Amino acid sequence: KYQYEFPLDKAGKAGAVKPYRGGKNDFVTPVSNLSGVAEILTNAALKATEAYSQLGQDRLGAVLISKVKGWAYADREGTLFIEESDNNNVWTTTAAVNVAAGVLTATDWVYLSKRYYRFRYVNGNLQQSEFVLYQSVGAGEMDVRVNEKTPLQIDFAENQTHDGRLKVEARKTFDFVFHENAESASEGAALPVDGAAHLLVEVYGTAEMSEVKFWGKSVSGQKLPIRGVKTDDATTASSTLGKAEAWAFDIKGFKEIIMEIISITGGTLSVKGTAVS
Amino acid sequence: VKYQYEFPLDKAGKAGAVKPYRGGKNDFVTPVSNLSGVAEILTNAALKATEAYSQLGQDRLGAVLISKVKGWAYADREGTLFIEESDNNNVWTTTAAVNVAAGVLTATDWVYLSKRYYRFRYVNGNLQQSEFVLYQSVGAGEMDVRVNEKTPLQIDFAENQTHDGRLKVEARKTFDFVFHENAESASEGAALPVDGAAHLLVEVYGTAEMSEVKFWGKSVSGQKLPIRGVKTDDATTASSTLGKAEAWAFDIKGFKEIIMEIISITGGTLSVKGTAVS
Amino acid sequence: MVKYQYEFPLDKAGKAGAVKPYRGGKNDFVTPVSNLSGVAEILTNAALKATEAYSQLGQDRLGAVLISKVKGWAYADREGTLFIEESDNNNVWTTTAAVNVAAGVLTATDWVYLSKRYYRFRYVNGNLQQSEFVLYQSVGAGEMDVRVNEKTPLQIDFAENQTHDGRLKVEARKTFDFVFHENAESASEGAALPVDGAAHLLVEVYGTAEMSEVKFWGKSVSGQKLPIRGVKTDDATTASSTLGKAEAWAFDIKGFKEIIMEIISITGGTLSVKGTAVS
Amino acid sequence: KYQYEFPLDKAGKAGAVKPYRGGKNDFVTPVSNLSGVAEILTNAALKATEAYSQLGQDRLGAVLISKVKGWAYADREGTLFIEESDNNNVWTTTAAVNVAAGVLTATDWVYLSKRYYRFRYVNGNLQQSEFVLYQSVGAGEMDVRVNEKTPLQIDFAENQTHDGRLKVEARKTFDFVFHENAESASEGAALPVDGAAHLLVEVYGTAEMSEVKFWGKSVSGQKLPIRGVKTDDATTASSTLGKAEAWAFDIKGFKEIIMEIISITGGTLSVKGTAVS
Amino acid sequence: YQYEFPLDKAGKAGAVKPYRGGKNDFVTPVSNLSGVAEILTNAALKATEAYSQLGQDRLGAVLISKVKGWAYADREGTLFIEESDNNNVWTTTAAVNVAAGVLTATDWVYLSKRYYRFRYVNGNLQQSEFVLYQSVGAGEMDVRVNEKTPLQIDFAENQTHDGRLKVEARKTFDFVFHENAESASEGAALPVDGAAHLLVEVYGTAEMSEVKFWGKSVSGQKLPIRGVKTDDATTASSTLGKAEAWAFDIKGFKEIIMEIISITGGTLSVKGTAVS
């Protein structure tokens, strides 16, 4: 017999309900998810350095336990361990929380992975005169629909922002091979520009003599001479007879870039670059 | 079979599946769980080496409309748990597959079902089990919810969508535009809508023996204003050209429209096409 | 009238309840529940002739349970079409959703959020007689307030249409037009462009005025006017003012608070000064 | 007494449950939050311009009412008012919704603040022959944890985007005081660059003579001369003897910028700027 | 009470409502306990008089996580939500002014200590009407949001500017090529990693020194690069000087090297900032 009393309906029928609406002419069953219920594991005061160990709790049964939370109160300091075991014999510690003297201490919800869970409480160097340890468990996952015309109010971790701004990377890089160890004249491979703005082209190899002609393609598909800027001396040219050098191009608006070996003698030539946004 | 739980009695001696609460334990509440938290044990029969357990097909269609299924397996030896679906309860397709290591509780994800029938199928590995249990949970339905907006929820981007803690973004857009296609007479041709583009590359090409293209933008008044372009081959700056088989780069920031007008043309055709970039 | 194979467990005193035991000792109880959205009614399992229709009687949403939404499942050995329909008068129907039901394939509708008073399912069989057919209907109601408690940030995912090569598509550029002067017929500073993070400005000067002088100004922190230089589009002239018209001037305005195009003098008609600022 | 029938378990016991699983060997209680339940307030047809007024409903009781929603159906047009009162005597309208002839009309959920709520319905200029008015109420707030390992797929409002692209602002602006009404030589305050790329500096005041020297600091902390471009004539210099003028600086890669007054006579000088990203 | 449980077809009472067109299905209306309230008091207080609820232990079969209050009075007062670990010494968690004749609600207060209570202090006028209600909650349901269905987000006001998301696209890092070098070496190679601009400072006691400016692209061979000196806009691929800074366009490079070719009569440092 408890202190609560179930109310009666108009015909004298008891129910675990509350009345509502202005005339108290409707009924509703008050409920709590099982995550809101708690079991008291122990209130036995521990000696200095003495431990309480809950018997292994099997998660597997009619209710499939997914998670566990603890509350500890003691008049002296100790440590609450949440532990897990796949064999109910060898235990690993999933969480450990300091329980200060005279301070209600709560764990987080711990999402379980192994088959068995337990609480283990180790008292500190002073004898408790007062101790309670409570355990809650939960289960399952309900589908929910957020109102389509009520946006979720979001913001970003302070680590993902600077001065209230989201940190973004707008620049992308990719390398491209026009020619690798070419030993004769050819256009080689055409770089697809794909929104890139800037291109750095390296010309290098054993070739005693070589000529590289700088080309872009726009809408017609015909090759158009483009000018590059040589890194060492700022020479601007639409071709080179040289090597062990690099050329910078503004390629905004082009569809393709071609570095054509027009002629080559007495060795090989590689033509490779990096395109940037 | 009586369990160790006992329903409490109210003040009038009435049993209920309730717990007391408030300081004086003078109120009651029914503990509940959505059915997604309930599980059925499918089998605990130990399998021989390579032997399979197959659940009979479960019809999703019923008084309770099953939307999703989740499994747990524990075995002292290794095996594989398959979640399968069938529209005819005869031919099975595998929706999910999980390796179950020896002595390790293994869980599937929630699998959202599409076909009419679902089942678990467990294939034991090369060693006979001495201990095996397989649990199945199902869910149904969808609760409409209004999220209390007192504090925003913190969101994050996939590690695949970030680089050095930065969100990867593409700010640049590209579009091609035809000013003139095989024009055989003088006209302004089509006006490019700038729409926040910053840079334009214009190619002039065709059979025309002679042609003049004049470079224009429009700002707020709608009157044509001469603009200057830079020719790709020699870095010539000009507001028009008598040439072809050439391309001209323009800064178009702030313009509403760009026009490449053929002023004159003889002895063939001329195309004028470009690519605008932001 | 109706006895199933489920069995209610007993408490320590032998009392049945619609509960499951839990905790290691099975010394606690919990009532398994499902929101009504998870429950279904079978509307029909009567096999239809070729082209024959099933029409559910209009369902009134208004009642002790206020129906907000409806979802359907259909299975048939032959192809057909499932319609979710609505009516304010239970007589004239509009189709809210229609789904093709392939032969031998469980077909689900979306949840349909209802607006009219009455809802129904209508199923029209295709050109082959069914030998097997079931049609299920689920309904829901209400809206629960919730508080979302997260221990980690929520991970977000973008539509494939919102991304390109694993990058979020963004527009960083904004454009706005501004009127400094419209058909001015006398000298004045006119209106001050608020720069507000814009970087580039194009200014057009046009009108009937026979003579005019426009002076180019920016304001920084003090609010004192500072002469600024523009580049004329037609010939790349750089200047801090103009006596001309039917011309446009490009300005780098990074760091300025305001831009002013002052008509210093004007005779023999009117003058407009208008521009576009770009970020 | 209704057409539904409670099923029986294997031992013949009735329950407000449904069977589930393949063998129908498990049970579940179908539930609805009370927000899904409705009361019919009235079906009494109104004269032209006649009102229905619900008696004030007290939110305070065993169920604490948080919110209210209405549905109205009538063969003629009218207006549904949701009203609140702190004294159950003076009524303020929180929401008013037009109810068209022959069209089910729903309000939004209205979150209540005063002690009492009611519906008031005012019929239009034509006598009703058919009218029903339904009220739903809610209460409370459930704590929930959203699945931490599953991405939410989100979609941007058309107002958040342009041509399918998310609208972003990459540029930031901040004002900085190097000197305010200085009347003597000093370095003044050092601008922290913090990723800014461009600086506009204004020099102004009564000083008869002044020299301002333009400095940046890199990693060592030593001052390095920098060059600015004067806005009116494009003069490039690392210092100025002038005032009522402004200087533009490229500050990319600098840690700090200093506008040093080297000398000043016969009045005061202010040096202020705007840094941009 | 005025409510009546309906009967099923066999005459069985239940806390249910009928539904579907034929009223041939049943459902149990429920409310989470957070929707339920207890009336603590309706005893009218004298001027300045206080009501104090006895300490409520959160620890029990139902583990109380949170509490919310409503107060109504015909005269003004103050509602305090308080917490205690010992049910003796109280700290105030929340305080809400209650205006005359105005229903006043607290927020949900998420409890930390073992015991909670409401304390109400009446103002300077005797109440003739007063009620005080208390709701509690417990637990936390795991949920899957909008599994098949796209949802909209809205950005924090702090992250937005004229309807645009504020982003920082520019990143900065400092790099040491050389610190107090006393002999010739390449020093450390800056990884460019998408940086576009580099500022390099050269400083120290060295009487004489040469720094050569290098980039590496795809081949891995050093390529001469040109810098612009901050003081006079000199362009060069090397310097014999110090107490100077050089700006480089490094777009497209993989690495940057500031090589000390020679050094006499002291030390030299070479340090920079790379930006995107």
Residue numbers in the entry:
A (entry chain E), D (entry chain B): 3 to 279
B (entry chain C): 2 to 279
C (entry chain A): 1 to 279
E (entry chain D): 4 to 279
Manuscript excerpt for this entry:
In order to elucidate their role in the lytic cassette of B. subtilis prophages, we cloned and produced XepA from the PBSX prophage and YomS from the SPβ prophage. The putative lysins XepA and YomS align very well, with a sequence identity of 38% (54% similarity) covering 85% of the overall sequence. The C-terminal disc of XepA is very similar to the structure of YomS, and the full-length protein including both domains is essential for cytotoxic activity. Both the XepA and YomS monomeric β-sandwiches adopt a fold resembling the C2 domain, which usually contains about 110 amino acids and 2–3 Ca2+ ions.
XepA crystallized from several conditions in multiple crystal forms. The crystal structures of the two highest diffracting crystal forms are reported here. Comparing the XepA structures in different crystal forms, only minor differences in the overall fold can be observed. A superposition of the whole pentamer of XepA crystal forms I and II resulted in an r.m.s.d. of 0.9 Å. Although it may be conceivable that high flexibility in the XepA linker region may permit a conformational change, for example a rotational movement of the C-terminal and N-terminal discs to open the pore area, this would require a major structural realignment. Comparisons with viral portal proteins show that the XepA tunnel has a relatively small diameter of approximately 10 Å, which suggests that it is too small to allow the entry of any DNA molecule (dsDNA, 20 Å; ssDNA, 15 Å).
